Write a protein that binds this DNA or RNA. Structure first.
Lengths: 171, 190, 52, 153, 196
RNA sequence: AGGUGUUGGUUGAUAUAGACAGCAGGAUGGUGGCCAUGGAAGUCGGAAUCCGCUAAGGAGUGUGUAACAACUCACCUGCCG
């Protein structure tokens, strides 16, 4: 995360160096991961994503709502608040329950980053489970993540299975 | 010329109890027992004083080349006493550029499964010395603590896993990879 | 790509060594003579050409 | 915004061997006008390179004559304006006026980084022998002349 | 050479001890030559600071025991870095001026720090540098409008903490001098009576 | 050609007013001394190689910069002898 933050900072140094239009002739041309510009993915398998899909996905799980899909309203403001709180130093821990602004815990412990725990930690777990071939983990994993498999990819395991799961999970 | 006498007294503590028999001593204390033979140098030992408080060594009528080997044996004896009382804790880290070095311990602290050394499929099994207890400790990236009694055995167990990482006949100026010794100390604090 | 302190620690053991003229022996950089019989303990030494 | 910078200009002749581009580049004011103003403000120096300070204001910079050690000595050893091709061995030698030495040492006391006129006269005459000259004798004679016979103020 | 200078130092110490029967014992720790010159800009002539080898001080005091018995208890007070300050103006003003005229400077990577390193909330006033030297040590640096501002005032080097080489470059880049190095007075000698 | 391989002579000095180790601190202001050089400040060249200021700081020992910047040393201090 700090490595990609330094990459975005170096791109911002390039923009501030060679910017002939500075904040109003051209506009806000600085790269921002909050708006959904910085794209994370790997095209060798096929999976690639932005922040907007996870900002739409995690607000349905935690904690509200469907429900009023139209229109430019409280739902869209909650999605923008979620993609704002994912980027930056906004720590989260399930023992606390609610949000926390400080870096240290009120009990006096370490607080993980939400961009680690909510996003990259289940991605590391699904890569670990697929590369280690654990059927008792991946059965409940498919049952949780709702992976639609109706072909011979149940029997075919390994790298084509990983590619199919990643392409179905993140188009 | 032959110098007649050059003594060197050693003030051993009460916790280190020794009992010489010829040129073979035994060392006991809080933990660890170490023995070493001294027949090759052919010197004279003298354990004097009531309740065995200090040791004395002699080298009668030896020249400049033979008196130089007397002071180093005192340093080896002091290192042995330090290994018996305090010990030796060697901490060391791993350095990689692109491919990480998979380090894990097998056979209860006597073998290291070195895997994936800079993209090489060959694996190495560097066995530790008898007596040295290797332990991969937590809260670090790569942290192998080495603990044991004898300084020669502990430093040999450090040197094997230090110089096991060798790049055969390439540019060592650009290729900067290898596991090396960084920290040296004792097991318990004095 | 590499830690600078660990990089200098790697430079201390391997690269930072004086090189003899005749036999090109690897010597510690606090020496006045060589340690090889094949050269004859040549006092002339050279620093190793570092990477730029 | 006040910025202080040194410009070591030739003053007298047209000094082409110089590199003063990154200093007043992104500011906006031309450095050639500043160099011409320094060369006009020197006037009677004509031979030496002097690290002139620039009190850069908001509108334009100001001119402050910096009293140098060797440059005031070779200024006191007055010369006609020489050629532009700058042939070597341009250092002069002769008789320096003691009143001119006092006039330089008063500017050195206004600079105020030494002893009360004595360290200033001695540090001028120490550079005088490094250039190569004599004021009725060299610097070992000047040490004798300063003790109990010089006009100590 | 040195043999004439060593004998001239005896003339210096006998002249100063015959001129001024009142002195201050100071200790100079990690002071610079420019800092000592800026001290002498204030204490140029009225206060003469003298230094030398402690054994030659001991021999000089053993020599002055034959002439003046009032210089008695200067022998056990020579401990560590001892320096004499010859002055005959006042005892209560110079001890405050020596505390007042401490010259600020940056700390050297390798020595201990007497004070705590603090970074105030102020922009750099330059182009956008990298954050690898700042964010790795612990200080969180938020980037807003070119210049990098410091939000969290995280103390890096504490009292007695070892100064590192990587954390010494950021202070030189930010041009911050929080420390105040100088001499520390140890003993006060006032006419055959040592006070503290 | 030599070799801190070892055995022996001569010269030169530092030395209990504390030399040799070994561990730390500065290593200055005029000044960026001058000529010339695309830059010479200590770092392509040629002549000067002196003062205030000490306890001491060379018109700067070396590494490195386009010039600077950065780092290190002789000469000088704290501990042991």
């Amino acid at each position: 995360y700090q490595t990609f933050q330094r990459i975005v900072e170096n791109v911002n140094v390039i923009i501030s160096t060679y910017g002939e239009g500075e904040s109003g002739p051209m506009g806000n041309i600085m790269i921002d991961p909050v708006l959904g510009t910085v794209g994370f993915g790997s095209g060798l398998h096929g999976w690639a994503f932005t922040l907007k899909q996870f900002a739409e996905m995690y607000v349905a799980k935690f904690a509200a709502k469907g429900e009023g899909q139209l229109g430019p309203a409280e739902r869209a403001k909650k999605v923008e608040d979620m993609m704002k709180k994912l980027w930056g130093d906004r720590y989260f821990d399930p023992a606390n329950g609610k949000f926390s602004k400080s870096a240290t815990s009120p009990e006096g412990k370490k607080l993980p980053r939400t961009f680690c725990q909510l996003i990259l930690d289940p991605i590391f777990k699904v890569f670990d489970a697929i590369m280690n071939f654990k059927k008792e983990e991946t059965a409940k994993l498919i049952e949780k993540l709702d992976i639609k498999l109706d072909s011979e990819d149940k029997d075919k395991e390994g790298k084509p299975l990983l590619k199919a799961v990643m392409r179905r999970w993140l188009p | 010329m032959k110098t007649i006498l050059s003594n060197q007294t050693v003030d051993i503590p009460e916790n280190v109890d020794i009992s010489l028999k010829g040129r073979t001593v035994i060392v006991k204390g809080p933990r660890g027992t170490l023995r070493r033979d001294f027949n090759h140098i052919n010197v004279e030992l003298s354990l004097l004083g009531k309740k065995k408080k200090r040791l004395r060594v002699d080298k009668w009528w030896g020249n400049r080349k033979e008196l130089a080997t007397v002071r180093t044996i005192c340093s080896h004896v002091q290192n042995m006493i330090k290994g018996v009382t305090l010990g030796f804790r060697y901490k060391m880290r791993s350095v990689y550029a692109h491919f990480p070095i998979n380090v894990v311990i097998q056979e209860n602290g006597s073998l290291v499964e070195i895997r994936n050394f800079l993209g090489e499929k060959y694996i190495r099994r560097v066995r530790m010395r008898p007596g040295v207890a290797c332990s991969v400790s937590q809260a670090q990236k790569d942290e192998l603590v080495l603990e044991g009694n004898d300084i020669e055995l502990v430093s040999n167990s450090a040197a094997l896993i230090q110089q096991a990482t060798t790049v055969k006949n390439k540019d060592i100026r650009k290729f900067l990879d290898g596991i090396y010794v960084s920290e040296k100390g004792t097991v318990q604090q004095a | 790509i590499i830690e600078p302190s660990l990089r200098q620690l790697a430079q201390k053991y391997n690269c930072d060594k004086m090189i003899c003229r005749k036999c090109y022996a690897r010597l510690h950089p606090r020496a006045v003579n060589c340690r090889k019989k094949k050269c004859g303990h040549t006092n002339n030494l050279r620093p190793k050409k570092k990477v730029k | 915004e006040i910025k202080v910078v040194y410009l070591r200009c030739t003053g007298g002749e047209v000094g082409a061997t110089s590199a003063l581009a990154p200093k007043i580049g992104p500011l906006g004011l031309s450095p050639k006008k500043v160099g011409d103003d320094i060369a006009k403000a020197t006037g009677d120096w004509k031979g030496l390179r002097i690290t002139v300070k620039l009190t850069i204001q908001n509108r334009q910079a100001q001119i402050e004559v910096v009293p140098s050690a060797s440059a005031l000595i070779i200024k006191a050893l007055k010369e006609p304006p020489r050629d532009r091709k700058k042939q070597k061995n341009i250092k002069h030698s002769g008789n320096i006026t003691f009143d001119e030495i006092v006039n330089i040492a008063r500017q050195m006391r206004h600079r105020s980084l030494a002893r009360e006129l004595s360290g200033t006269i001695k540090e001028i005459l120490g550079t005088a022998q490094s250039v190569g000259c004599n004021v009725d004798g060299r610097h070992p004679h000047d040490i004798i002349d300063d003790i109990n016979s010089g006009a100590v103020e | 050479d040195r043999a004439t200078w060593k004998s001239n130092y005896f003339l210096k110490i006998i002249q100063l001890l015959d001129d001024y029967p009142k002195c201050f014992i100071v200790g100079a720790d990690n002071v610079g030559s420019k800092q000592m010159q800026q001290i002498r800009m204030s204490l140029r002539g009225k206060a003469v600071v003298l230094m030398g080898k402690n054994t030659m001080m001991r021999k000089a005091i053993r020599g002055h025991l034959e002439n003046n018995p009032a210089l008695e208890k200067l022998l056990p007070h020579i401990r560590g870095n001892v320096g004499f300050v010859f002055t005959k103006e006042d005892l209560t003003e110079i001890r405050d001026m020596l505390l007042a005229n401490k010259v600020p400077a940056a700390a050297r990577a390798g020595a201990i720090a007497p004070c705590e390193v603090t970074v105030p909330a102020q922009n750099t006033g330059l182009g956008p540098e990298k954050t690898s030297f700042f964010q790795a040590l612990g200080i969180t640096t938020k980037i807003s409008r070119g210049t990098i501002e410091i939000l969290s005032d995280v103390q890096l080097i504490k009292t007695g903490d070892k100064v590192g080489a990587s954390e010494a470059t950021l202070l030189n880049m930010l041009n911050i001098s929080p420390f105040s190095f100088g001499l520390i007075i140890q003993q006060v000698f006032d006419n055959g009576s040592i006070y503290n």
